Amino acid sequence: LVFTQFWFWFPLSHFLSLAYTPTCVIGLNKDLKMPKVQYKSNCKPSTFAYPAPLEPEPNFQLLDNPARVMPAQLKVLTMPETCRYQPFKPLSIGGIIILKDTSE
Amino acid sequence: QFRNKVLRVLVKIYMNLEKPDFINVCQCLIFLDDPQAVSDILEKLVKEDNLLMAYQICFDLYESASQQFLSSVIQNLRTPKDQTLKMIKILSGEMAIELHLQFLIRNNNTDLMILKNTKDAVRNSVCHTATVIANSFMHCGTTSDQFLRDNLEWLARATNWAKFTATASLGVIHKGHEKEALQLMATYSAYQEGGGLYALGLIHANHGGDIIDYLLNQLKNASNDIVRHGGSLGLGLAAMGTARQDVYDLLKTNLYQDDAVTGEAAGLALGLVMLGSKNAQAIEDMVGYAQETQHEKILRGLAVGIALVMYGRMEEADALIESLCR
Amino acid sequence: AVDTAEQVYISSLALLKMLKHGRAGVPMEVMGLMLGEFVDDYTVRVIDVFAMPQSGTGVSVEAVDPVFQAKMLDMLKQTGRPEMVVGWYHSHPGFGCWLSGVDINTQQSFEALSERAVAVVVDPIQSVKGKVVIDAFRLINANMMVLGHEPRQTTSNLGHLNKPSIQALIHGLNRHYYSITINYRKNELEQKMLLNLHKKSWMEGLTLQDYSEHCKHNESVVKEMLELAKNYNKAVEEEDKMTPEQLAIKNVGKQDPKRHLEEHVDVLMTSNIVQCLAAMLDTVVFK
Amino acid sequence: VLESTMVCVDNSEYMRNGDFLPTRLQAQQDAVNIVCHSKTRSNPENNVGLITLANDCEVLTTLTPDTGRILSKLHTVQPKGKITFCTGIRVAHLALKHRQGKNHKMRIIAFVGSPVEDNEKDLVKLAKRLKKEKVNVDIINFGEEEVNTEKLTAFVNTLNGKDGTGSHLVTVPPGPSLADALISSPILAGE
């Protein structure tokens, strides 16, 4: 609202900082820390990436614990078959999730 | 009313399963308000020692619930210790903004060639300010002060209410980096000071720490209209939702100081501070000042503020809506 | 620095006075002073205006008469307005809304006394019922425009006035002077009298048209309707027959029976229905 | 001192009386001449107007720094009718209120040598109104030294109150032209 209200005062153009919502999935252990987990997405690495920054083609991708995940590239997001960490909240929900741990 | 009743029934049912789906229960409570129930459930989680899910629920609560709801939950919990403190930190922003800040800092795949081309194309103050805003928009939490460190002369070219915009861009790029406030604005005129206060508010957007008190003191001690405008913007931005009587009083005094530059910011900041509150006193005061004053800038600010003061309150607004429309 | 959001609010009385002076002195660039107050740094009310003598030829501004100005101001203060001079207005009958060299010199003279003085240019000839051609101006500094500065500050997006006209651009806009946006004050009380204009008394509302004249008018109009019916029969016949030129070049210079017949039916039906209703209402009320 | 004054002149039928040489009309003309000359010699920003008290209770010339206009207008005057003087003073006070110079001290000087048949209650009421609205009056009486002098003294005292010195009265018995007394009166003496 305040950003759109910039005609009468340009300095109000910065209010989009509020609207900017990081689109990401972050895995946290029981220690409120970031384990080096690897999420798996069954999406081609051209349907979801930054284009032209300044095997023919796989249907496979992997991301680190801090992961850039968009609403479109979140439903197909998953994790490997077996891992030390299992996402308590389904990945399809998105957001910052917690990872239940195995024995060690 | 019927939606609330259905939510009550759904919450009660969810609290009857072999695997109680507390994430959906907490979503229902968020949509229902009533923070006491979620606070009691949260203490029950602490007692049961279910830290994983008891922490996922807190992440969800911070993500969705409003600041007032979060504060109510916090005070309810006030009325073991390490778990309580970690949970309170998570609920009241602590580490919740830091996680996103660190994530965005490391994931900052920006492309500065686009902005090099843009600034090559810039020829006037409008485009200069637009490029400043674009740089701020591309950085956001990512604190890469790349251009604003490399090109001091290009930044220094624009003046007047362009120092304000550049400092607000500093606030945007430093957003989330709440730890180094004051210490970090020590890097950087009335326009500069107002922009710095607005940048502090922007960095602490929707996070009412001691920066609210700092902004209150600086706005009380403010001497120029530009600095008062910047301080009001920053204070309201920091205290959005957190309806505080002292903040309201200072902002109202600044508004009643009938200067257009400070008046617009004062109206917008009153609206921000009292967002969703719907107190007849402030609604009446703002409408009366809008109808009394003779400064179109102050009218614009008060219009935005009156719009914001009722963010929620969907149906119980028709009286004010009709009055304003007529 | 000045902002690209300044707004000159010309009151209804001010606008009417400028337009009257305009279509009273033509082609002379008649001139007057605009009285108001700089309420803030972004707004200029022009509460009133008053003309100047316009001595002799007035194709150019006439070096405002200080004694006349002073006596105007003193008497206005005596009988009301305690307001200072916020600018000067003058007429450009058909030229447009630009400023000449003499206008620029006079506006320098006004700024020297008051840096905020505005220069309003009205166009009484080009004004029409619903859009009055008028523009506010202040002069750009040669010093800054040579020393690389924009003599306006773009805090707002209010610099979209009308995509300034080519006439103004070639006559010196955006180089030696800039246009200030103009708005108007609506009170809903003066508007009541402005609406009372065009109003007809109940005498006229209830009067019946002379019955003999009404009958003669109906007879005549029906006669033209008869002739247009003949011509309409002719035209509809040779309309679908060929349409190479029927689109646009088959009615230019020639009467359109359908159009004129529609006009005649409209006018006569209006007249007859209105007179019938008037007669009936009269027969009852005046019983 | 900035002074906005008006001279109320009674021009009743009695002002063909010859007790003042040559006639009360010429004596009044000389009196207004000298008082207006004193006003001019005072702060030139001071301005003077003229009111005639008769059956019409009219205002001849409003506030104006110039004096020739007032002199010509008063010369173009004849004595007719009776005096009201209540209208007179009220209209004078309205002229005071509607003066271009608000900073000018309000002043009415009334030549009222005549029988004033107005009830003392309304006289005192008007005096109280004038004093509470802060207009001082310097009344001048001649001819009838007994018929109305008591009423005028009471009126001036009512204006005075306890310390309202601005209100004054000057009564002159018959004799030569009404010049020596007006010159050697407290009113022009304080100028």
PDB file of N, CA, C and O in Angstrom, chain C residues 29-66:
ATOM      1  N   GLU C  29      -3.027  41.964 -24.217  1.00  0.00           N
ATOM      2  CA  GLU C  29      -2.642  41.062 -23.135  1.00  0.00           C
ATOM      3  C   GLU C  29      -2.939  41.748 -21.801  1.00  0.00           C
ATOM      4  O   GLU C  29      -2.050  42.157 -21.051  1.00  0.00           O
ATOM      5  N   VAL C  30      -4.238  41.872 -21.516  1.00  0.00           N
ATOM      6  CA  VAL C  30      -4.655  42.526 -20.288  1.00  0.00           C
ATOM      7  C   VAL C  30      -4.077  41.776 -19.095  1.00  0.00           C
ATOM      8  O   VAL C  30      -3.725  40.591 -19.175  1.00  0.00           O
ATOM      9  N   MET C  31      -3.984  42.482 -17.969  1.00  0.00           N
ATOM     10  CA  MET C  31      -3.169  42.021 -16.859  1.00  0.00           C
ATOM     11  C   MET C  31      -3.776  42.462 -15.534  1.00  0.00           C
ATOM     12  O   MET C  31      -4.482  43.473 -15.448  1.00  0.00           O
ATOM     13  N   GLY C  32      -3.483  41.682 -14.499  1.00  0.00           N
ATOM     14  CA  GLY C  32      -3.966  41.959 -13.161  1.00  0.00           C
ATOM     15  C   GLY C  32      -3.102  41.245 -12.148  1.00  0.00           C
ATOM     16  O   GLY C  32      -2.202  40.480 -12.494  1.00  0.00           O
ATOM     17  N   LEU C  33      -3.394  41.502 -10.878  1.00  0.00           N
ATOM     18  CA  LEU C  33      -2.654  40.926  -9.767  1.00  0.00           C
ATOM     19  C   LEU C  33      -3.499  39.872  -9.066  1.00  0.00           C
ATOM     20  O   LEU C  33      -4.701  40.068  -8.849  1.00  0.00           O
ATOM     21  N   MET C  34      -2.860  38.756  -8.717  1.00  0.00           N
ATOM     22  CA  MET C  34      -3.495  37.645  -8.023  1.00  0.00           C
ATOM     23  C   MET C  34      -3.160  37.738  -6.542  1.00  0.00           C
ATOM     24  O   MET C  34      -1.980  37.668  -6.164  1.00  0.00           O
ATOM     25  N   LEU C  35      -4.203  37.851  -5.720  1.00  0.00           N
ATOM     26  CA  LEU C  35      -4.104  37.988  -4.275  1.00  0.00           C
ATOM     27  C   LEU C  35      -4.434  36.652  -3.626  1.00  0.00           C
ATOM     28  O   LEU C  35      -5.455  36.033  -3.949  1.00  0.00           O
ATOM     29  N   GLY C  36      -3.584  36.227  -2.695  1.00  0.00           N
ATOM     30  CA  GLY C  36      -3.777  34.975  -1.991  1.00  0.00           C
ATOM     31  C   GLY C  36      -2.812  34.828  -0.834  1.00  0.00           C
ATOM     32  O   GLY C  36      -2.579  35.788  -0.093  1.00  0.00           O
ATOM     33  N   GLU C  37      -2.242  33.638  -0.661  1.00  0.00           N
ATOM     34  CA  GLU C  37      -1.259  33.426   0.390  1.00  0.00           C
ATOM     35  C   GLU C  37      -0.538  32.110   0.144  1.00  0.00           C
ATOM     36  O   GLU C  37      -1.168  31.113  -0.215  1.00  0.00           O
ATOM     37  N   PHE C  38       0.780  32.119   0.338  1.00  0.00           N
ATOM     38  CA  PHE C  38       1.591  30.905   0.247  1.00  0.00           C
ATOM     39  C   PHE C  38       1.424  30.143   1.553  1.00  0.00           C
ATOM     40  O   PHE C  38       2.181  30.322   2.508  1.00  0.00           O
ATOM     41  N   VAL C  39       0.411  29.275   1.600  1.00  0.00           N
ATOM     42  CA  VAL C  39       0.102  28.569   2.841  1.00  0.00           C
ATOM     43  C   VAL C  39       1.281  27.707   3.272  1.00  0.00           C
ATOM     44  O   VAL C  39       1.573  27.585   4.468  1.00  0.00           O
ATOM     45  N   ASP C  40       1.974  27.096   2.317  1.00  0.00           N
ATOM     46  CA  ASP C  40       3.103  26.231   2.629  1.00  0.00           C
ATOM     47  C   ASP C  40       4.106  26.309   1.485  1.00  0.00           C
ATOM     48  O   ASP C  40       4.029  27.192   0.625  1.00  0.00           O
ATOM     49  N   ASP C  41       5.057  25.376   1.480  1.00  0.00           N
ATOM     50  CA  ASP C  41       6.081  25.323   0.447  1.00  0.00           C
ATOM     51  C   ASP C  41       5.602  24.644  -0.830  1.00  0.00           C
ATOM     52  O   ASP C  41       6.343  24.641  -1.819  1.00  0.00           O
ATOM     53  N   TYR C  42       4.396  24.072  -0.835  1.00  0.00           N
ATOM     54  CA  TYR C  42       3.899  23.329  -1.983  1.00  0.00           C
ATOM     55  C   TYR C  42       2.545  23.807  -2.487  1.00  0.00           C
ATOM     56  O   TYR C  42       2.030  23.234  -3.451  1.00  0.00           O
ATOM     57  N   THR C  43       1.952  24.830  -1.879  1.00  0.00           N
ATOM     58  CA  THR C  43       0.598  25.232  -2.226  1.00  0.00           C
ATOM     59  C   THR C  43       0.492  26.747  -2.272  1.00  0.00           C
ATOM     60  O   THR C  43       1.077  27.444  -1.439  1.00  0.00           O
ATOM     61  N   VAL C  44      -0.263  27.247  -3.249  1.00  0.00           N
ATOM     62  CA  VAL C  44      -0.505  28.677  -3.391  1.00  0.00           C
ATOM     63  C   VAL C  44      -1.982  28.909  -3.676  1.00  0.00           C
ATOM     64  O   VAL C  44      -2.443  28.715  -4.806  1.00  0.00           O
ATOM     65  N   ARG C  45      -2.741  29.299  -2.656  1.00  0.00           N
ATOM     66  CA  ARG C  45      -4.108  29.747  -2.885  1.00  0.00           C
ATOM     67  C   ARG C  45      -4.099  31.093  -3.596  1.00  0.00           C
ATOM     68  O   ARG C  45      -3.336  31.992  -3.233  1.00  0.00           O
ATOM     69  N   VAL C  46      -4.945  31.228  -4.614  1.00  0.00           N
ATOM     70  CA  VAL C  46      -5.203  32.518  -5.238  1.00  0.00           C
ATOM     71  C   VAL C  46      -6.652  32.868  -4.933  1.00  0.00           C
ATOM     72  O   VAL C  46      -7.564  32.505  -5.683  1.00  0.00           O
ATOM     73  N   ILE C  47      -6.871  33.566  -3.820  1.00  0.00           N
ATOM     74  CA  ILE C  47      -8.232  33.797  -3.351  1.00  0.00           C
ATOM     75  C   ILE C  47      -8.966  34.747  -4.285  1.00  0.00           C
ATOM     76  O   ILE C  47     -10.149  34.547  -4.587  1.00  0.00           O
ATOM     77  N   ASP C  48      -8.290  35.790  -4.758  1.00  0.00           N
ATOM     78  CA  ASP C  48      -8.946  36.776  -5.601  1.00  0.00           C
ATOM     79  C   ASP C  48      -7.947  37.296  -6.622  1.00  0.00           C
ATOM     80  O   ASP C  48      -6.767  36.950  -6.598  1.00  0.00           O
ATOM     81  N   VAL C  49      -8.442  38.125  -7.540  1.00  0.00           N
ATOM     82  CA  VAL C  49      -7.596  38.826  -8.496  1.00  0.00           C
ATOM     83  C   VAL C  49      -8.215  40.192  -8.739  1.00  0.00           C
ATOM     84  O   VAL C  49      -9.394  40.420  -8.460  1.00  0.00           O
ATOM     85  N   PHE C  50      -7.409  41.116  -9.254  1.00  0.00           N
ATOM     86  CA  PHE C  50      -7.948  42.409  -9.649  1.00  0.00           C
ATOM     87  C   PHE C  50      -7.148  42.964 -10.819  1.00  0.00           C
ATOM     88  O   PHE C  50      -5.918  42.893 -10.832  1.00  0.00           O
ATOM     89  N   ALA C  51      -7.866  43.523 -11.790  1.00  0.00           N
ATOM     90  CA  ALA C  51      -7.272  43.994 -13.030  1.00  0.00           C
ATOM     91  C   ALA C  51      -6.481  45.280 -12.811  1.00  0.00           C
ATOM     92  O   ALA C  51      -6.598  45.947 -11.778  1.00  0.00           O
ATOM     93  N   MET C  52      -5.667  45.629 -13.799  1.00  0.00           N
ATOM     94  CA  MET C  52      -4.922  46.875 -13.813  1.00  0.00           C
ATOM     95  C   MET C  52      -5.448  47.793 -14.913  1.00  0.00           C
ATOM     96  O   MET C  52      -6.214  47.366 -15.785  1.00  0.00           O
ATOM     97  N   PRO C  53      -5.062  49.076 -14.903  1.00  0.00           N
ATOM     98  CA  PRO C  53      -5.728  50.039 -15.799  1.00  0.00           C
ATOM     99  C   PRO C  53      -5.682  49.669 -17.272  1.00  0.00           C
ATOM    100  O   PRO C  53      -6.641  49.959 -17.998  1.00  0.00           O
ATOM    101  N   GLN C  54      -4.601  49.049 -17.746  1.00  0.00           N
ATOM    102  CA  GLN C  54      -4.443  48.745 -19.168  1.00  0.00           C
ATOM    103  C   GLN C  54      -4.498  50.037 -19.991  1.00  0.00           C
ATOM    104  O   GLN C  54      -5.410  50.287 -20.781  1.00  0.00           O
ATOM    105  N   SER C  55      -3.490  50.873 -19.751  1.00  0.00           N
ATOM    106  CA  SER C  55      -3.419  52.188 -20.373  1.00  0.00           C
ATOM    107  C   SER C  55      -2.953  52.075 -21.819  1.00  0.00           C
ATOM    108  O   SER C  55      -1.936  51.436 -22.106  1.00  0.00           O
ATOM    109  N   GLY C  56      -3.698  52.700 -22.726  1.00  0.00           N
ATOM    110  CA  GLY C  56      -3.316  52.735 -24.123  1.00  0.00           C
ATOM    111  C   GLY C  56      -3.223  51.344 -24.719  1.00  0.00           C
ATOM    112  O   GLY C  56      -3.979  50.429 -24.373  1.00  0.00           O
ATOM    113  N   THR C  57      -2.275  51.183 -25.640  1.00  0.00           N
ATOM    114  CA  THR C  57      -2.028  49.875 -26.228  1.00  0.00           C
ATOM    115  C   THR C  57      -1.520  48.911 -25.163  1.00  0.00           C
ATOM    116  O   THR C  57      -0.752  49.289 -24.275  1.00  0.00           O
ATOM    117  N   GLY C  58      -1.954  47.657 -25.259  1.00  0.00           N
ATOM    118  CA  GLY C  58      -1.612  46.660 -24.263  1.00  0.00           C
ATOM    119  C   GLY C  58      -1.202  45.328 -24.855  1.00  0.00           C
ATOM    120  O   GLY C  58      -1.315  44.291 -24.195  1.00  0.00           O
ATOM    121  N   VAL C  59      -0.719  45.340 -26.098  1.00  0.00           N
ATOM    122  CA  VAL C  59      -0.195  44.131 -26.713  1.00  0.00           C
ATOM    123  C   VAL C  59       0.954  43.539 -25.910  1.00  0.00           C
ATOM    124  O   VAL C  59       1.333  42.387 -26.136  1.00  0.00           O
ATOM    125  N   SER C  60       1.510  44.303 -24.972  1.00  0.00           N
ATOM    126  CA  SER C  60       2.547  43.837 -24.068  1.00  0.00           C
ATOM    127  C   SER C  60       2.187  44.259 -22.649  1.00  0.00           C
ATOM    128  O   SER C  60       1.409  45.192 -22.438  1.00  0.00           O
ATOM    129  N   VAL C  61       2.757  43.553 -21.668  1.00  0.00           N
ATOM    130  CA  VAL C  61       2.511  43.921 -20.278  1.00  0.00           C
ATOM    131  C   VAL C  61       2.956  45.368 -20.060  1.00  0.00           C
ATOM    132  O   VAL C  61       3.817  45.899 -20.772  1.00  0.00           O
ATOM    133  N   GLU C  62       2.356  46.012 -19.057  1.00  0.00           N
ATOM    134  CA  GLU C  62       2.414  47.464 -18.931  1.00  0.00           C
ATOM    135  C   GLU C  62       2.997  47.932 -17.600  1.00  0.00           C
ATOM    136  O   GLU C  62       2.543  48.934 -17.046  1.00  0.00           O
ATOM    137  N   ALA C  63       4.006  47.237 -17.070  1.00  0.00           N
ATOM    138  CA  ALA C  63       4.794  47.827 -15.991  1.00  0.00           C
ATOM    139  C   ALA C  63       3.920  48.215 -14.802  1.00  0.00           C
ATOM    140  O   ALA C  63       3.678  49.406 -14.582  1.00  0.00           O
ATOM    141  N   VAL C  64       3.444  47.227 -14.042  1.00  0.00           N
ATOM    142  CA  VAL C  64       2.312  47.382 -13.127  1.00  0.00           C
ATOM    143  C   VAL C  64       2.337  48.740 -12.439  1.00  0.00           C
ATOM    144  O   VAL C  64       3.377  49.181 -11.935  1.00  0.00           O
ATOM    145  N   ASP C  65       1.191  49.405 -12.420  1.00  0.00           N
ATOM    146  CA  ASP C  65       1.055  50.746 -11.862  1.00  0.00           C
ATOM    147  C   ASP C  65       1.135  50.701 -10.340  1.00  0.00           C
ATOM    148  O   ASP C  65       0.184  50.231  -9.698  1.00  0.00           O
ATOM    149  N   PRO C  66       2.226  51.167  -9.721  1.00  0.00           N
ATOM    150  CA  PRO C  66       2.334  51.038  -8.258  1.00  0.00           C
ATOM    151  C   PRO C  66       1.245  51.763  -7.489  1.00  0.00           C
ATOM    152  O   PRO C  66       0.762  51.235  -6.483  1.00  0.00           O
TER     153      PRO C  66
END
